[model samples]
Target chain A: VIRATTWKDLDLPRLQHLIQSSFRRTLIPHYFETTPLLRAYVSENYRAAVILTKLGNVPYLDKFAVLDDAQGEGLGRAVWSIMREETPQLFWRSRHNNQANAFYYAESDGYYKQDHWKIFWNGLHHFQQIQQCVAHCTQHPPTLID
Target chain B: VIRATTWKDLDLPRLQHLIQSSFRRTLIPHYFETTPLLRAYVSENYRAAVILTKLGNVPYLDKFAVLDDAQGEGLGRAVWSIMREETPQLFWRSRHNNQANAFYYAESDGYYKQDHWKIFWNGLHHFQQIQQCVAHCTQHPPTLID
Candidate 1:
């Protein structure tokens, strides 16, 4: 079952484990400060997680990772649907060669591709504001470095 | 075209008129105290409007109306879609016998029926919090004199 929770309600060590295991090559941190707003979609057994952060007026998807053993059960889509429904304006970025580009392209309202990163934003109406958000997201990298 | 605007961007008299003409029997106000967070979706010509207020942590749909001449078009749905996307936790109430119950019922996650009002809440996760929101909404009637 998919559940929404805050950082206070989560098992931090378990979450870190899940994140690291999901992205084996990525240099995720062992400790990090909690964001002002954090929503985590957890698996029934606490094996998978998709973390979202509220940044200014926009919701930024900080991380999405399902345990290697827990993949293929549609948890990613479930978490994404909840996120998209909750946030009208959302922005995020992914590495240029990430496998999830196809899905992000299909879901995003617009995207700006950079040399190393591709910034994606959804539900923004103003043209100038969309450009600003894209630039902001691309420039400010996530706290949890890959 | 539909546009999202703030109270500072809208003309109060024009909004009041649209609300009054759309709900002919109801006694809407000529002037109103703006909430800390107010989001309005309006038609280009200002014939239809949906006004949302951020009350506490939830987005309260304070007013939703379209002029008689603009009723047949999908402006109402467009406004609602925008509001729903922006707000994860939303609550509103209507008189028990109101005709819009069917549509609200379909859109809402759950509802509580009182003698005079039916409180509707959408996208709430915590059961106790949902109950609290219902009570809060039911106690506070619309600002407009009925």
Candidate 2:
């Protein structure tokens, strides 16, 4: 089942392991410290996570990953469904070639393409504000480097 | 301070009193019964409230009122600011002539005006889905009528 969590309640080593293993990259500690909203779908073992940070009133999806071996078992989709329902306004960036681009496009209200990333946002009313969020996500790359 | 409450903890009679007194109308209890999500900004005396119901994933603002005597002290705004932050996506309707229309228009992402009521929504991505919500709210008039 999907459950809300905090950095303090998590097993840092296991979380780090799941993240690094899924992305095959190392993320800076700042990533964890800055993400105040964390939700994980776990069953005996950790299956996936949707980590987020607030940008004004909007929540930015900082990182979302599922264990490689668990990908086909539906954990990622279950976690996503819950997050989307709970969070009304949210946005995130995905590398242009990321396999998840199609899914992001289908779920998002709108998106803008940048040189290296595509910024996706959902549930924003003002055009100017949407542009502001798009610019912020594109300019501020996550601390994770692949 | 605005406090988050579950249906079980709320004093139903007091809530009913506040709503009936503020709106000067009687509400069908089923509207309140079907709503699982409710928030109130109360004092030693219940001063204001922002009642809500869930339509799928969206929180529909069913009733928002501050006691007639407490109208301009910013209590309504305070309750609204907190609710907006906590629930990223929300929508509500107000009568076309209601003075609060100006405030709703300013705060909402978009609004639809009908013959009898004006529907407002925020943090929605799909135009078709937004339309669906507008239709739902306009059709499902609040149990309270002025």
Candidate 3:
């Protein structure tokens, strides 16, 4: 089962723990900092989670993590299914060489690769709006330093 | 390894055999027929394949199949990686309820859903062109009767 909520109803402690544990072994890893956001979808076991924020007028996939112990259960897909159905259009970015890029490539409609990051989006179809998404995402700062 | 060639260079018997064996158990099975098309990508072992034609000027993913015994070997992904690399923009339609729609959902940039067909596209970003794809695909005919 998965659960959904807005920032107002979110469980801070549980949320951070899940992100921290999932990223415990990464290089240039990310830390979840407090932020105002639209919504969150998470596996009941808390092993998979997605946080949706916005970039300009577009829904930005702020965070997506599937815990180390929960890698192959399709929970990531499960959480993503809820995430996409809730909002058909969205955008986000990932490190240039991140291993998850294989999954990223499969899931994104299109992406713009830069020196250190590759910005990606889904369901957006106008070049002008798409350019805005790229510029906004490429310049967005990382949440917290490792 | 995957090989790339035009339809003229394609080996029909091998192509048909792979598709026939792959869809042997499908409920509304499909069969290969002669046609004029752009490209073909197939596994060296001939267990997986993808054929690209066009919908107007847009690349149409005409056929994608992985033989029954080769399902989990990642050949499907391998073949697709090559297809996407060659043409970043493409489109196709699949039965709305195809089991592969999950994979399709992840890979497409966007789609239009009609009664029994879900027309999908990759890297398309203009409303007029996307609309053209939707209309062209919805009116496309199935290749052959089972």
Find the candidate with the highest lDDT and give its number.
Answer: 3
Kindly report which residue pairs in candidate 1 clash with one another.
Answer: none
lDDT of each: 0.65, 0.69, 0.71
Better by TM-score, candidate 3 or 1? 3
DockQ (C-alpha based) per candidate is 0.01, 0.02, 0.07
Clashing residue pair totals per candidate (backbone < 3 A): 0, 1, 1
Candidate 3's displacement at residue A128, Å, is: 7.9
> How high is each candidate's TM-score?
0.46, 0.47, 0.55
Q: In model 2, which regions exceed 4 Å deviation?
A: A38-44, B1-146
Q: Put down candidate 2 lDDT per residue, A81-106, tens digits, no spaces.
A: 87887788887888767767656645
Candidate 1 residue spans exceeding 4 A from truth? A1-146, B1-5, B25-31
Q: Look at candidate 3 and give me any clashing residue pairs.
A: A125-B125
lDDT string for model 2 (B18-133, tens) is 87877777767665567767554454366677776766457888778667575533776777787777878877888754546656745666555554666778787665666677
For model 1, the chain A TM-score is 0.80
Residue pairs with colliding backbones in model 2 are A123-B123
Query: What lDDT tens digits, residue by residue, belong to model 1 across residues B1-146?
Result: 35455676777677777777777755434346545436777777778777777776777877777666665786666667877777777888777666566676557654555556677777765556756776777677566556
Leading candidate by DockQ = 3
Q: What's the CA RMSD of model 3 in angstroms? A: 6.6
DockQ of 3: 0.07
